[PDB]
Amino acid sequence: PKHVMMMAAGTGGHVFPALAVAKQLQQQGCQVSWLATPTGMENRLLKDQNIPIYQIDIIRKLAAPFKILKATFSAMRYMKQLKVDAVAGFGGYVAGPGGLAARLLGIPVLIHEQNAVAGFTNAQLSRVAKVVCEAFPNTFPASEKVVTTGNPREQADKPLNILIVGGSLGAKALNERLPPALKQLEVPLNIFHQCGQQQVEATQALYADAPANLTIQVLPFIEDMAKAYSEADLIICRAGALTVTEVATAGVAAVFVPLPIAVDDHQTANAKFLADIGAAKICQQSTMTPEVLNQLFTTLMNRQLLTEMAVKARQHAQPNATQHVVDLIQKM
Amino acid sequence: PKHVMMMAAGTGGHVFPALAVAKQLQQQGCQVSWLATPTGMENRLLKDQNIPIYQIDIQGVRGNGVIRKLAAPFKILKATFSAMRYMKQLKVDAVAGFGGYVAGPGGLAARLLGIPVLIHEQNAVAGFTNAQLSRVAKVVCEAFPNTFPASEKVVTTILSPKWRYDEREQADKPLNILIVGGSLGAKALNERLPPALKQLEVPLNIFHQCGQQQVEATQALYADAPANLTIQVLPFIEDMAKAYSEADLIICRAGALTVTEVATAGVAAVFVPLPIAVDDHQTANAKFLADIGAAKICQQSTMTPEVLNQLFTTLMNRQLLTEMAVKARQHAQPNATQHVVDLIQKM
Amino acid sequence: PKHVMMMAAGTGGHVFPALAVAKQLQQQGCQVSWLATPTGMENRLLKDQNIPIYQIDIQGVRGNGVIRKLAAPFKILKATFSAMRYMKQLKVDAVAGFGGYVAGPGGLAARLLGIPVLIHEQNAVAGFTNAQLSRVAKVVCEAFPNTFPASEKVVTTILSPKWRYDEREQADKPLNILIVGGSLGAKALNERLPPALKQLEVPLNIFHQCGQQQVEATQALYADAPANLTIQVLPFIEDMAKAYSEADLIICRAGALTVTEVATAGVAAVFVPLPIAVDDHQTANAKFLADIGAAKICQQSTMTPEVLNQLFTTLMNRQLLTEMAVKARQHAQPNATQHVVDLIQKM
Amino acid sequence: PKHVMMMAAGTGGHVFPALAVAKQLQQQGCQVSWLATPTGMENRLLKDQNIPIYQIDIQGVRGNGVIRKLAAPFKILKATFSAMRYMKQLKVDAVAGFGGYVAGPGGLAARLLGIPVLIHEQNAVAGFTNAQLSRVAKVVCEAFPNTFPASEKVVTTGSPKWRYDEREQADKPLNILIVGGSLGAKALNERLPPALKQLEVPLNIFHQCGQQQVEATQALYADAPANLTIQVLPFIEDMAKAYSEADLIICRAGALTVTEVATAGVAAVFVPLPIAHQTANAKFLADIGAAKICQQSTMTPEVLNQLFTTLMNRQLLTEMAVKARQHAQPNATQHVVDLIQKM
Amino acid sequence: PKHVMMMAAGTGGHVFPALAVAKQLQQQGCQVSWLATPTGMENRLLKDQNIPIYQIDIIRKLAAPFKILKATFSAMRYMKQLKVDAVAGFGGYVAGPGGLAARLLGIPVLIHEQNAVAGFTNAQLSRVAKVVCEAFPNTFPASEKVVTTGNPREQADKPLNILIVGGSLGAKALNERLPPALKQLEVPLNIFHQCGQQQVEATQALYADAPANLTIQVLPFIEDMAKAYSEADLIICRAGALTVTEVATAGVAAVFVPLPIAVDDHQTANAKFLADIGAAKICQQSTMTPEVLNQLFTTLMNRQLLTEMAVKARQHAQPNATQHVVDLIQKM
Amino acid sequence: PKHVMMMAAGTGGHVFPALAVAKQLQQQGCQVSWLATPTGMENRLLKDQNIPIYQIDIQGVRGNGVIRKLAAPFKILKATFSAMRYMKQLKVDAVAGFGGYVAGPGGLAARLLGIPVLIHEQNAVAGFTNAQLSRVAKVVCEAFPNTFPASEKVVTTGSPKWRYDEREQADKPLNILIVGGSLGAKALNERLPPALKQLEVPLNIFHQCGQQQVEATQALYADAPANLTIQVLPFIEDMAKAYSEADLIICRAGALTVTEVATAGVAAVFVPLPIAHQTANAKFLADIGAAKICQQSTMTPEVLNQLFTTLMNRQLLTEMAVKARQHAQPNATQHVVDLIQKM
């Protein structure tokens, strides 16, 4: 049986696409192992997932040029003992040391970058990777890289369903500035607003001042996220990597308010995928004012416009990425 | 009869657009003052520039043993009032800020006095101090078209290179590629660029800028096989304007003002944007011309001998370089330094 | 018909004077809002206080790996506009700030909106954010008389302990000294204070507050020789008001509000001010009553068994303690919490 | 009632010998007090130990809005006098300090008052506080002989069956005991199974893994363990049992654990912790004794077999563990108490 | 001959009073040695002063509780070799370790604090000092401390001589805010203004706008400082420790603008010595506005008021501190 | 024309042996290249050395307004590939790395390409980069024998008169040579004069003080120097002369200076630098040889006399310096060049 070792850092949501590839690999007769750091976030996520996790190097401090050597040989020892046959790393630092360790052992490397702007380790690692999977098309240049995506409205005069998702986090900026310029919209709306935990009371006050024609509901979490998508006629949310990939895979018109201070503005680069082809608008948080909000929503409240947006979005997406990546790993 | 105070930080290239707008404001009968930090490089750049510089302090003080550490956030409040006193004492009539940290405190200080504020952002992605300041500014100049959302003018700063087709219509000329690495010289360009250039089977004329004390190093890389290429290595370019017009393809850092120069002269460009730029802003500057179809962008990180050759193989056609250079010159905004001066005066 | 927003930082004891002024503003028909930081302790103090708290961010972000480090000075500009949006959204009619970092950004934000600002400084030496903010505030309340130079009111926050002579005129009472170490307990007071007290040959009645989980430790120090002294050790004082009136001499940290309590009740005090206070401000608070002749100040650093006894030897006279307590009560400003509320409304 | 004050740092190693001598002093009619830092871990260890603890602060103060930033070396001066009044107030008659940061200020505090100082160093290489303090100590207890060269230094460091007797096992597989420390023991779990499961000898491997590391190493073992009867456990409840049964022990060369292996006379292959001075602890038994030392940095699965190949005969291990037990310093807790009292 | 060792840190101007005590000790038949840190500022100041300097402990970093032990025994070795007979330390960190080293050897310690608020090392060190000299009276409590000070106008209708000294430093706040509210004073003035080096051109512009009745002169440095004092009818300057002690020793009315962020506000505590007895006013820099400046100067422009101020100031000063400290050192 | 690339860190110790082997390789018809960091000091040392230098960046980037803050471990990854293309571009045939930070990235870069690696470790305790790199090195040169335990490790470290011959001095005072390093030598100036001026033997003390320390120690000496003929100098222009004349040397146990004292066969009392591993360098000559080792931390004027009392006879020093010279490894620069070429 072929033994693939996965590399994903928990911070930056690399595990969730990696987890999909690994679990599918298991079901196709492979053996999966995970290389992670101790005190890395991957450990909490992969609890109860029943694939073995291996950690490498650690109130002590060891110099940077040394710490890289300890990690590379630590991982290399793990791959040689466990007879690791191929390694797939989905980005983050852990891929760096393990990736060299793989190459030194001679086992081939597959990297997958799920953002539109290539992350630092995956850019360097791209030169020794046997295959470089890219979520978005122009993330890498030339032959080695193959594109893939990470994770898998009729009119009966119904009102516009507006969906606002803040995330597991607060996403304060949506909770605080959206109700004000939204509850002064003339058209009839149906707001389904996901606040995050400790902001439910606070923002429900922001809405209730002038409900007017439109109905409103505020909730902390959405149990069935898939239901909320199909019915939503316009979605307002962070341009995360999976969130952009989900908004595309199900055709939903969207107005992306990308995460500020994200590192290579990768969140805006994610959103700019759908934004410049014309499947979603991007409204920067820093420059967001009542006038740009209202003039953006004023022109967005035509349900036909949202459908033209949402169909272009469902077209521009790669549907079978979870199994498309698995194929590449095995043919190595 | 008007007194404008300029805010531009030296570290980023904002002093240069500000200085140009400042110089014309002076000669248009105005008096200009500069608000700058004491530890910024803008001071040396404006030495012998005949505009008075007034300083505010932004770095948090620490550990003298006679003076206790003063948190940076306390100093930013002091800088706001330090600058506010300056504008009231000097009776400043308008404040124009090109970005950098100092424009932030000074900008609030102007608004507290009631002075109107103009900000100018020279990048394609808005820098943090200008984005916040935009909410309280009277006029917002934006370099590239969709940098801010609404009600702001779109104007960016020897703009006389002739039109791209005429300058480009050459009977049997050698390709004449140009590589500019900066005042300091881009190590990443000086090595690994000659290797893929001297593997091209077409006759070209390379003029390469490596930067000081790096001349010997890059001159060595070139020497191995110049069969059909005539190469020259230089530290800096005396005349950038002529070097532009004669250039059929330019390869250079995306820069902020360099995108504007490549656009304003109409040169097909291969932008190799600066790595780990703060909001990847150099890629965004380069994506301006790239998306319209006048430049290709080739990242250092992903760049190998093979991706270089596959890019040049298709780029060594003069019909293509002209088609590119024309698209670039179309979307260029000249006489905009004069456009910003005008906006300031009507405030 | 008026909406005031309060700015008080939790770490320093500014939330307490602000909360008192806030509570009366509410019951005088106003509505009050609190501008606070997300990471400040003011939030826990105002829990279950029935005023809405609105947060602005002041600490510079760093090293997420998904989010780049954002310099603290950038965040202070964001906080100013974050707060400015809050005041405009909530239609704040006046802003009153008691010091701390948050009052700084929020204060500029109010002034940018045109909202009038009242600051209140509860120390004898002005803290940095209030000193700068004073240039742009409509009304400046100062706790102690010469804290600021001109055109500002001088008012500081169960002020009903009876007049010092009446409460002090006691027929054959034991001296009844009081020692209060804080909510946490002042290690420096709990040790080395009993040693010099139990070396006094006069009959006294010690009521000593050591603080939680420190009761056993200080109770041991006391036990060696209580021949003429009756000592009691307690963790905290349930009733501070009665504990004040009965106290003939108080020894305690100079504090900000504690100087005001010792003054407003009229108790002779020995202030042992907090070490390495930021502008030595606790000594300045204590020097208020000390210079007028109502309290002695005895520094921890210089304090030895001998200097303690030489201080108490002269301080164990009840004629002196009364003379001191009277001088302290004379310079006290009661009904000033109500005085600050009034200033806010006329703005 | 002679009044001794002890000095012990937050890290566990300094306090345990200090506690042992302190508790022994108490049963001998003395009065014992402890000098410790606040927020140091000694407090959790001395909780309910029925010694009064006195805290002296040696950590620098971080800037606060309400208090100033105070550089650490200034607090160290406060600490020295802060401690000095403690000894004058408490009428301390002698001071016994086992090393660590806290001992430095307290030791000067003692000498300034005129109190005598006894220091005890539990490592084979002298730690900086004891090194400096050696000049002002009345008596210097040294764990190992090659620590201090002075005229008045004594040698000692704070019941199982004799080695030869315990190792007389007619016929049985080699019992190998691997104790990965609580701290930094990951390196042991990672490269020991590789070379152990490639030994053609009968072994009975008892491996102490540390919590949350159990599953991972069991994966390393189950690959071709022909004849090894391996058991992996996270921590050992009764460590004393493990020693006697242990025919070869593989472990970090701690300070306390070196003397334990010597006291029980068990053959050992010490893989000293690489950041500590810890290597000098192994070289005590390695050089004049017979236990073996294998450096971690250069340690590979390939050199392990070359070391283990020669170590897998019980005669060599017995010869080793006899030499190790010969050198141990027993009744050393009581030897230090005596030195304290004659001061 | 008696051998005294001096301890002074260069930062905070401790050497200048110490230097006076030491050089006088030399002239009275003593032997003087200096204990200092390497890379301490004391070394540049004591160059060319011909008393031997000894340094102790040092891109390496050694933990704080260890660094104190190394320093104390380093100094102790120096005192034992050089047969140091008494030690006088004028504050700063170097006094801390050496001071213990002195006590451990049994040589007596004399400390001198030249500020009104006791510095951190001198406060702790006060318990083992044989004699504690204090510049200002209430700096220490009780018997051991003895007070001392560190370093040694008729009307012919002449105009008010205003003297503004910024220091070796810029003292920007005086150069920038004083000319504005001063050049709009009605009375006739004579400004002698010490700018500091790179501010001479800048501030001369600030004055020349409205010279009016009063004459002005701006200079970088004052060659003869003593001359500038006697003629000055009002002085405006930082409340340094020596500057307050100099303004007192020569009777000069003064308005102190104490150094901001000084550590225990010691500069204001220095000024408050003369300020609350009525020999000088204090105008805080942070709160300083055109209105408080003008209302302060408006009431200060009477030459009789300045004389009442300046005589009270010359009274409250200790004149023979340099020789008063030397006596204490020898009787030890 | 075999193309070797060298790897050397900014600190002087790694580069000097590297430079010696590099220059020797060049005279043997090879092509030599250097891997170094930018802003590292190797550049100043290799200036005008007629070797092409190639820079790889291993230092973390501080946040700037215009560029992001980049954590150091990320730059280390860039460095490894940044260096790797250098070797592919320059057609490097073998890599010789003498330790330090730069060697780590370059060594992986070599192995990834398939280039062979030779490392050489100049200390007696193996440094971390060479320790890890030992697993992938084709040949491991070790300065001292007890560094690595492998099958393919060799022993060596990069003209004056034989000891016995040079020490045959009919009648003359003991020439004592004290070289305080350029770095951290203050401790030597401070406690050597005390115990030297209390020796009742004829000495001729030559003391190397270091700049700006000259006057201070001369004060320490002039106090009762009865018979010592002392000379203090800041630095020694001709150090080779000082060795031959030196009858006892007192000095820091550097890495290069240990092998120099051994090569010239001079008796030494090593006071190793206390923060370095430097102590392990002295123990080479101390243990199997006869030069003496005196720890700095515990070092007092009182133990110095007890050490010097026994060291002041010329027979003992000669017996020592003969044993030290016996163990030196000469023509070791040429021994490393040979190992490089057979790769």
Tab-separated table of C-alpha atoms in Angstrom, chain E residues 2-154:
chain	number	residue	atom	x	y	z
E	2	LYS	CA	44.124	57.910	52.458
E	3	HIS	CA	42.844	56.266	49.257
E	4	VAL	CA	39.242	57.057	48.300
E	5	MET	CA	37.547	55.418	45.316
E	6	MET	CA	34.845	57.331	43.453
E	7	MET	CA	31.711	55.905	41.824
E	8	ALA	CA	29.784	57.921	39.282
E	9	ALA	CA	27.871	57.119	36.132
E	10	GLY	CA	28.358	59.547	33.271
E	11	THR	CA	24.687	59.621	32.241
E	12	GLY	CA	22.734	61.866	34.590
E	13	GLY	CA	25.713	64.157	35.261
E	14	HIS	CA	26.937	62.437	38.395
E	15	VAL	CA	30.603	62.810	37.456
E	16	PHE	CA	30.641	66.610	37.490
E	17	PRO	CA	29.863	66.891	41.225
E	18	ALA	CA	31.925	63.771	41.911
E	19	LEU	CA	34.789	65.230	39.871
E	20	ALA	CA	34.764	68.340	42.049
E	21	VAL	CA	34.963	66.261	45.251
E	22	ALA	CA	37.705	64.016	43.879
E	23	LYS	CA	39.943	66.751	42.464
E	24	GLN	CA	39.690	68.610	45.764
E	25	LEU	CA	40.540	65.378	47.587
E	26	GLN	CA	43.685	65.123	45.461
E	27	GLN	CA	44.760	68.630	46.407
E	28	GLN	CA	44.349	67.818	50.108
E	29	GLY	CA	46.816	64.931	50.043
E	30	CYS	CA	44.486	62.031	49.247
E	31	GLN	CA	44.687	59.366	46.586
E	32	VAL	CA	41.697	59.098	44.276
E	33	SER	CA	40.684	56.177	42.035
E	34	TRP	CA	37.583	55.856	39.894
E	35	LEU	CA	35.342	52.802	39.566
E	36	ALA	CA	33.306	52.929	36.386
E	37	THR	CA	31.732	50.660	33.859
E	38	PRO	CA	33.260	49.944	30.437
E	39	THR	CA	31.127	51.544	27.739
E	40	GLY	CA	29.907	53.925	30.443
E	41	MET	CA	29.864	57.629	29.753
E	42	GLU	CA	32.145	58.412	32.711
E	43	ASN	CA	35.146	57.427	30.617
E	44	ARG	CA	34.844	60.243	28.070
E	45	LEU	CA	34.319	62.813	30.831
E	46	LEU	CA	37.281	61.671	32.938
E	47	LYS	CA	39.667	61.636	29.981
E	48	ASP	CA	42.471	64.126	30.646
E	49	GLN	CA	41.527	64.411	34.325
E	50	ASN	CA	44.497	62.350	35.572
E	51	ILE	CA	42.789	60.126	38.104
E	52	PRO	CA	42.941	56.397	37.370
E	53	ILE	CA	39.753	54.711	36.165
E	54	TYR	CA	38.875	51.057	36.803
E	55	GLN	CA	36.149	49.139	34.917
E	56	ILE	CA	34.454	45.881	35.889
E	57	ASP	CA	32.048	43.620	33.885
E	58	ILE	CA	30.847	43.543	30.234
E	59	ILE	CA	27.740	41.564	22.143
E	60	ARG	CA	27.350	38.941	24.913
E	61	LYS	CA	24.472	38.648	27.418
E	62	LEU	CA	24.726	37.212	30.962
E	63	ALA	CA	21.610	36.871	33.167
E	64	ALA	CA	20.756	39.685	35.597
E	65	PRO	CA	21.178	37.786	38.915
E	66	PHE	CA	24.561	36.545	37.698
E	67	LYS	CA	25.702	39.907	36.249
E	68	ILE	CA	25.359	41.507	39.693
E	69	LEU	CA	27.605	38.899	41.293
E	70	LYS	CA	30.313	39.237	38.660
E	71	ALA	CA	30.310	43.019	39.084
E	72	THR	CA	30.396	43.003	42.898
E	73	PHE	CA	33.402	40.661	43.081
E	74	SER	CA	35.091	42.427	40.155
E	75	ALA	CA	34.960	45.708	42.070
E	76	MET	CA	35.829	44.023	45.365
E	77	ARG	CA	38.974	42.639	43.802
E	78	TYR	CA	39.900	46.158	42.605
E	79	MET	CA	39.425	47.704	46.076
E	80	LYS	CA	41.440	44.958	47.806
E	81	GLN	CA	44.385	45.173	45.334
E	82	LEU	CA	44.532	48.983	45.364
E	83	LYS	CA	44.091	49.141	49.156
E	84	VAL	CA	41.056	51.424	48.851
E	85	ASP	CA	40.445	53.162	52.184
E	86	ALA	CA	37.009	54.749	51.633
E	87	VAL	CA	34.490	54.843	48.803
E	88	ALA	CA	32.210	57.705	47.740
E	89	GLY	CA	29.570	57.040	45.125
E	90	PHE	CA	27.552	59.851	43.607
E	91	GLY	CA	24.721	57.735	42.188
E	92	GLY	CA	23.974	55.612	39.187
E	93	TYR	CA	24.240	51.891	38.752
E	94	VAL	CA	28.029	51.526	39.192
E	95	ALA	CA	27.545	52.548	42.829
E	96	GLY	CA	25.310	49.544	43.396
E	97	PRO	CA	27.776	46.707	42.873
E	98	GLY	CA	30.813	48.604	44.061
E	99	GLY	CA	28.916	49.745	47.140
E	100	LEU	CA	28.257	46.178	48.259
E	101	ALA	CA	31.871	45.281	47.430
E	102	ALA	CA	33.009	48.084	49.647
E	103	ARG	CA	30.784	46.908	52.488
E	104	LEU	CA	31.930	43.293	52.099
E	105	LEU	CA	35.548	44.482	52.379
E	106	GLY	CA	34.554	46.648	55.348
E	107	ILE	CA	35.546	49.971	53.785
E	108	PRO	CA	32.909	52.621	54.593
E	109	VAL	CA	30.518	54.064	52.041
E	110	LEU	CA	29.512	57.687	51.492
E	111	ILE	CA	26.757	58.368	48.949
E	112	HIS	CA	25.705	61.766	47.629
E	113	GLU	CA	22.404	62.354	45.842
E	114	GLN	CA	22.328	65.628	43.889
E	115	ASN	CA	18.604	65.520	42.950
E	116	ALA	CA	15.613	66.443	45.116
E	117	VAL	CA	14.074	62.973	44.697
E	118	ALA	CA	16.376	60.141	45.755
E	119	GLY	CA	17.556	57.863	42.962
E	120	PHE	CA	16.891	54.129	43.053
E	121	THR	CA	20.400	52.912	43.871
E	122	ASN	CA	21.057	55.627	46.458
E	123	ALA	CA	17.776	54.843	48.219
E	124	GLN	CA	18.672	51.164	48.663
E	125	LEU	CA	22.346	51.931	49.296
E	126	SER	CA	21.338	54.416	52.025
E	127	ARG	CA	21.008	51.552	54.544
E	128	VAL	CA	24.706	50.516	54.342
E	129	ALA	CA	26.183	53.985	53.791
E	130	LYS	CA	28.218	55.426	56.635
E	131	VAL	CA	27.171	58.958	55.590
E	132	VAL	CA	24.393	59.966	53.174
E	133	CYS	CA	24.817	63.442	51.646
E	134	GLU	CA	21.662	65.009	50.199
E	135	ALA	CA	21.508	68.029	47.892
E	136	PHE	CA	18.092	69.107	48.874
E	137	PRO	CA	16.840	68.975	52.442
E	138	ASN	CA	13.979	66.517	52.532
E	139	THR	CA	15.605	63.967	50.215
E	140	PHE	CA	16.427	61.654	53.141
E	141	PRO	CA	14.978	61.135	56.619
E	142	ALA	CA	16.801	61.121	60.031
E	143	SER	CA	20.360	61.131	61.482
E	144	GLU	CA	22.814	59.611	58.964
E	145	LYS	CA	22.168	62.114	56.154
E	146	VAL	CA	23.725	65.582	56.127
E	147	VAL	CA	22.662	68.234	53.619
E	148	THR	CA	25.000	69.724	50.987
E	149	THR	CA	25.034	71.117	47.423
E	150	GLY	CA	27.226	69.702	44.683
E	151	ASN	CA	28.972	72.257	42.407
E	152	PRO	CA	30.533	75.768	42.790
E	153	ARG	CA	21.188	94.153	40.511
E	154	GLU	CA	20.911	97.967	40.681
